[PDB]
């Protein structure tokens, strides 16, 4: 297999970590980045494709999609981080 994913290790926590958030600059306005949801299943769609140069241009294409059920979040805290020479 791939050495980038070895050894085969169980995830330390059931949730999942973002690890890397996108790099921030102050020129854009304020916006949040991540969100949760809960997976519900998968279903099929048909999409009128709008891809120039593909064989499936302007014709129906069946596509497998996933459905993630996302109830609204609630903001409860605000943590702030300071930039140290240890991270």
């Amino acid at each position: 297999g791939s050495l980038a994913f070895l050894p085969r290790k169980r995830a330390a926590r059931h949730r999942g970590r973002v690890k890397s958030f996108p790099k921030d600059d102050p020129k854009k306005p304020v916006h949040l980045t991540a969100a949760m949801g809960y997976k519900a299943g998968m279903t099929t769609i048909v999409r009128d494709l709008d891809r120039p140069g593909a064989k499936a241009h302007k014709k129906e294409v069946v596509e497998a999609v996933t459905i993630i059920d996302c109830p609204p979040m609630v903001v409860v805290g605000l943590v702030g981080y300071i930039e140290t020479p240890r991270g």
Partner: protein, 62 residues
């Protein structure tokens, strides 16, 4: 073929990020930030304005 970390491919990608996908992500992010705004707007040691103390492995113990 040319590698995915090739310098020419990186420069071609950098021109796409600046000229083609640049303003499209800027316009979408403007609409999302306007939506978060609508949801949001819907003595110093006694007032807390002046920051004080709350409530050592860097220096040797004297």
């Amino acid at each position: 073929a040319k590698s995915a970390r090739a310098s020419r491919i990186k420069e071609n990608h950098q021109r796409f990020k600046k000229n083609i996908a640049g303003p499209v992500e800027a316009a979408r992010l403007e609409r999302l930030s306007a939506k978060l705004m609508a949801i949001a707007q819907a003595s110093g040691v006694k007032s807390g304005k002046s920051i004080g103390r709350k409530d050592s492995s860097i220096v040797f113990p004297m």
